[PDB]
Each structure stands twice: as C-alpha cells, then as structure tokens.
Design a binder for this molecule. Structure first.
Ligand SMILES: Cc1ncc(COP(=O)(O)O)c(C=O)c1O
Ligand SMILES: Cc1ncc(COP(=O)(O)O)c(C=O)c1O
Ligand SMILES: C=CC[S@@](=O)C[C@H](N)C(=O)O
Lengths: 390, 386
C-alpha cells in the first residue's frame, strides 16, 4: 500500500475495568459496545500528557479555544461553520439530552424518536418520566424509510414536545440527506417541537456523502434545533466526557447551559478541554486513515457475509463503524441468537432488541477493530450459523 | 518527601489563576496551590498509556479502596455494597434533590453553609429552610429545638448536612452527627451528609460519617465523599455515595445514571484508587503544612490585624475569619481588598447565615503565598484607617 502514518493494527491493552474487554472468557471476542480497538491519534495523546504535567487539577473554565476548535472542525470536515457563541460544553451527549429532556419538556410529555434507535434514548426519556413515542422506520426491500405523514402527525401532537433525532442514525447507520434533515427541522419548528440532533456519528460517514448538521437549517427552523457533537465516537474517547451542544437560539442555549450546570455535566474534567481541542485541531489526518481502515473492514465483512452467510443480510449503511445485520431468516430472537453465538463461538455482538423497532430481527456488529479481529468475528459468525443448520 | 513549596503552573483556562491581573493573589476558590501526590500522578500517567479510552466499569477495587480509606482515615468502615460511584458530590446532591423531594418541598441546611447547597436546592425548585447555627463567643452551635421543629415540618423532606461544615471548618462530634441523624430518621427526613472535607481534619479527631450511625437511623442517611478536596483533584470528577439503605441506593444510583454522573471518565477510577490506596503519606504531609499555615494566619492577624478573628476550626484548609469588628460588609471588604492589594478572598455573604461578617481564606497554598496574602490583608485594613 501507501504507508499509513498511524497504527490500526495493535489492539490497545485495557486496564481491568474495561466494559468491552473486562470479564471476558478465554478467546472471547467482543464486537458489541461502540468503542474502537485502535489506539487514539498521537496528537491527542500528546495534548493529554502535556496537560498532566500541570500536576494539579483544580477547576477549569471552557476557553474560547474549545469552541474555535469545534467550529473549525465542523467547517473543515462538514463545510458548516457554526457560530462559536452557539457552542456550549457538555460532559456528554446522552447527559446533555437527559438535561434538555428535563429542562425543555414536562413530566408526562412525549418525546419522539424513530425506532429502531440507540437504546440510551429510551433510558433518558423514560427514566426522566417522559414518554417515548416513535414514528417507526419502515423496513421493506432491505431498507428503512420514514413515514413522513406519521412523523408529522406525532410531532403535531400537543404532548409531543421534543424529537431526539439520530443524525447519522444508530443502529441502521444512515446519514440523512440535507433535504431530510431540513425537512425534519422544519417539521419540528412548524409544530413548535425542539429538535435534538444527536450528531455523534457525524464524522464517521464512511463515504464522501456529508452529514447535514441540524444547525445549518435556515432561520425559521434554526431557532428550534440543537446539534450535539463529541470527539468520543470519532476518536475512540468515550470516557473523555467532552461534548458540545450547538444551539443557535441564544435563550434556548443559555437555558440548556444552565441545565447542564445544574445536572453536573457543564464543567470539563481535567483532560476534556486539551484533548478535545487537539482532536478537533489535529485529528484530520488520523480520521482520514481511520476511514480507510473502516472501509476496508466493511468491504471485507460485507463481501464475506454476502458470499458465505446468505442466511443474514447486512443492511446498506453509509455511516458509523457499526453494521446492522438482519438475522430474521434464522428464525431466532436476536437476544437468543446472541446468547447462543457467544456460548458456541465466543463472539459477542449486540442483540438488536434494545434498539426496539424491529431490532429483535437484527444484530449490531462493531467493525472498528484491526482487520484480524474482523476476520475472526466474521468466521465465528459463520461457524455459529452453520452450527444452527446442523 | 513532597513539594508543598512551589505552585503548579496551570494552563490558561484555570478558574483560580486564569485571567488574573499582574501579581493578583487568589485565595478564594477551594483548590490547592500544591502539586498532587506523585502516587496519584503515577496512576494517571500509566492509565493514559492505554492510548484508548472506551467505556469503563466501576470495579469493586474502587469500592474496596473507598472502604479501606474510610477505615484508615476515620476508623469508620462502610460496606462495599453501600458504595455508588458518582462524578461529583454537588451533582449527586442535585440528583438526589430531584429524586427524593418534590418541587416546592423544603430542604434544610444550617446557615452559614456552602453556597452551592443553595444553588442545587433553589436551582431545582426546592425551598431552602435553615436552622441557623447560633454564633456566640466566636463559636457556632446548633439550636436543637429549632432544628427539630423545622425537621418535623411536613414539607421539610431532606437535610443537606455539611460534615465537616464549610465554611466554618467544623468536624461535628460523634454525638452531634448521631443526634442529627436520629432527628432526621425520627421525622422521616433524608440526611444527605456531604463529607467532602472529611479527610482534612487537622486536629487529632476523626469525623463521624453519617453511614456509621446505627440502624435505627442508618436507613435515612447518605454519605458523600470524594478525593477532590483532599488531593486537589476538583477536575478529576471522582466521588462516591455511601448509601446503607439498598432501596435508596438503587434509586440514587439510577438518578446518577440519568443525570450523566454515574459513569467514570478515563482517569476517575485509577486516580481515585491511587489516592485512596497510596495517598496517606502525602495527606499526612499536607496537614502539617495546613496547620503551619493556619498557625501563621492566626498569629499574624492576632498581632497585626487584631480587629479580625480567625475562628477556631478543626477541619478543612479554609479559614473562616470574623471581620465584624472592621464594620464593613464582607463583600465590600473583599472587593476593596482585591482592588487595593490584589488579594482575592471569598466574601462570606454567599454562605448566607451571618456570612456578611466573615471572609473565607484558602490556606492550601505555599507558606510564602500565605505570608503575602496576610500582608496584603493588613495593608488593606491599614489603608482603610487612612
Ligand atoms: C447515537 C449515540 N448517541 C450518543 C452516544 C454516546 O454519547 P456520550 O457518551 O457522549 O453521552 C453514542 C455512542 O456512541 C451514540 O451512538
Ligand atoms: C461542602 C462542599 N461540597 C462539595 C464540594 C465540591 O463537590 P463536587 O465533587 O461536586 O465538585 C465542595 C468543594 O470543595 C465543598 O466545599
Ligand atoms: C468562593 C469560593 C468558591 S469555592 O471554593 C466552592 C468550594 N469548592 C468550597 O469548598 O466551598
């Protein structure tokens, strides 16, 4: 090849309290939870080791440099520069959603999602005492589509007060077109519904199709949107706890910031600021190479399952390092299949059940690991399927 | 064995030191101007070498380190099962305010007390009620009749207890903590005992954690701890709730997850474990520097600014200074001090109670900074008399 500047071959050796790699049995292969088995960009590491040299970790403000980095990143990577004053630090995307659920809806209000969607959406809606309402994505011809009439009918319902929009959508791995994003933002604005656009997979569109950040919608609807971003999925920094809400409406923004502070997610920890700035200032080259690795892993995985496991169907996706795999032909509830698969092969993938929708027919597989592990997992999956047919 | 002489060089986004004018001396916000313990630094450096920061569990090595630390430092040992990770003490209070009380309910504090108690009570739409600490003869005391009368009020549903008490720097006696816990249990009031200053008792005394009170009251208590104040790790975001009642504990744990404060960041677990397993020697050295600084502060002011009084305190690195004899509202005295001398201390007003007669001074800094701050304090008063 042309030499890659960075290391996508060696799996980082985690400490014992890793969710992905802790308490596994011998030879078990975790490909479920969405973190990478790649080392992070050395540019980010350098900024973290630099910060540690302070050797005292008192209270931190959010510097202008943080929002500048966020804005520069969105401009360069997605050709949509937010205003830096739109940006508000939050310690995490899901905690920010949870705080905005409490701040911008009332107990008993309904909050719209499009099932199947990220399981943590349900937890922060239901656990906060709001009610999930879904305009289900319709599954036909191996693709999901939106029932736009049903979506609007639910948005227009008085008790439906917020839409948590997954953009790109996890677990189906779909980066919405500009038209779809602006249509949903316009729908929300029309019906006075707050659009929370979870854009945490936005840097991981594995094609050149870009995302459309919600904050780029025109100024009728722009006052009704919040874009949520983080370096965590892009750069393998789940535990960094750095995120950013982009809220063009200044009063909404100040209220969300107040809700972040009140909840305890408004203040950066000791690494969040320098590590996120380094990621958004200097992570471009590493991300470029990562997407080349991911496209290689996906090309292999999709080709393998096409030729070798016709019992399953990998859905066409263009975003995320996660594959959404239809296992319906196995006649087995995804939760039962994933248990069986783990017991027989050691491969641990995500049952689709927790994403609701039709997720009980699907598994989600994380391909953000060295190709050796992709090959291992794909072969284990075939071994699991073959063991059923016998 | 450790460096308590040289102030760490912060990056620019520091709350205590960022954006100061030339030669300004901040002694207000409670973070130290000391290097952290090298044993903690070692664990952070090695964790960064993982070079990938995915999701982390709370290992029960964390709970074991917490239990061991409480036993060594306070002679009190919680059951590991009682322990729930939280990223911060104040956010845990805020979550428990939302989980365990209703909007409009009253939540009892003992003024003057930590300003952030008011922020999380009132910010969540609960109402602060205070049984004010009685201030007589330079000492604060509890009006036990008043306290119980308010705790017995039906709409008073929670007590946020500062143990040791910031800003006065008082580690309650065993009898005091038990009596408060008994009163809370008697009136079905949840006792949230903020013990974040619990490792900073400077006398030969020990705090009494709320979780040590006996089972006729232990079901009504929550102890909150963190290495933050002890080890100068405000930005680590590691803390722990100790909740003996398992029903409360399950509900508190869920409220932390929903708030976004239930999950450790990439350094919280190894750094806190290192602090609790290996920080005893550094803390022992810290306390002697703190006692030396308090002694200097008390002696200097007794000789030089006799119209002010450093309260006898047994806990924390925060001096609570009665300035009432200056005849000046504390907030105006602090603004005047900053403008005239560059010394930035904490006005007492924000702690409510009788806080307008007090300032709070952070002595967790090298002796040379204390000497400077005291000198500026005297100079400000001298200039007022001129
Ligand atoms: C759609 C979506 N939102 C949010 C998150 C995580 O957000 P955070 O950990 O910053 O709260 C993930 C995880 O990768 C995700 O897939
Ligand atoms: C009484 C008290 N509680 C809590 C805190 C800080 O809590 P948190 O861990 O939320 O920053 C402080 C600050 O040092 C404090 O003095
Ligand atoms: C004005 C001072 C802000 S502050 O120090 C809150 C603090 N951490 C404490 O211990 O009270």
């Amino acid at each position: 090849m042309a030499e890659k500047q960075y290391d996508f071959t060696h799996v980082p050796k985690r400490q014992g309290n890793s969710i992905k790699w802790g308490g596994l049995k011998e030879k078990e292969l975790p490909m479920w939870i969405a973190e990478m088995d790649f080392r992070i960009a050395p540019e980010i590491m350098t900024s973290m080791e630099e910060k540690l040299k302070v050797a005292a970790f008192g209270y931190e403000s959010v510097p202008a440099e943080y929002y500048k980095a966020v804005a520069d990143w969105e401009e360069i990577e997605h050709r949509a520069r937010p205003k830096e004053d739109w940006c508000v630090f939050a310690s995490g995307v899901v905690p920010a959603i949870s705080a905005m659920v409490r701040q911008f809806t009332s107990p008993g209000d309904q909050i719209l999602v499009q099932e199947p969607v990220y399981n943590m959406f349900y937890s922060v809606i239901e656990g906060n005492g709001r009610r999930v309402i879904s305009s289900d994505l319709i599954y036909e011809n191996s693709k999901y589509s939106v029932n736009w009439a049903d979506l609007e009918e639910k948005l227009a319902t008085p008790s439906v007060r917020m839409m948590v929009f997954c953009n790109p959508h996890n677990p189906i791995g779909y980066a919405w077109s500009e038209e779809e994003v602006k249509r949903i933002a316009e729908l929300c604005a029309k019906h006075q519904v707050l659009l929370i656009s979870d854009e945490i997979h936005g840097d991981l569109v594995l094609t050149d199709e870009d995302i459309t950040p919600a904050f780029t919608v025109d100024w009728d609807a722009k006052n009704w949107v919040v874009s949520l971003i983080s370096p965590s999925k892009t750069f393998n920094l789940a535990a960094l706890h750095a995120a950013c809400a982009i809220i063009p409406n200044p009063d909404l923004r100040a209220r969300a910031e107040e809700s972040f502070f009140l909840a305890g997610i408004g203040e950066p920890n000791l690494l969040a600021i320098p590590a996120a700035i380094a990621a958004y200032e200097e992570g471009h080259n590493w991300l470029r190479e990562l997407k080349q690795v991911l496209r290689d892993n996906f090309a292999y995985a999709r080709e393998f399952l096409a030729k070798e496991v016709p019992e399953v169907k990998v859905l066409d996706s263009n975003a995320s390092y996660l594959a959404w795999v239809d296992i319906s032909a196995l006649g087995m509830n995804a939760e039962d299949f994933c248990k069986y698969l783990r017991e027989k092969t050691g491969l641990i993938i995500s049952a689709g059940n927790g994403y609701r929708g039709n997720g009980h027919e699907f598994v989600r597989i994380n391909l953000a690991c060295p190709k050796e592990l992709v090959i291992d997992g794909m072969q284990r999956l075939k071994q699991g399927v073959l063991n059923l047919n016998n």
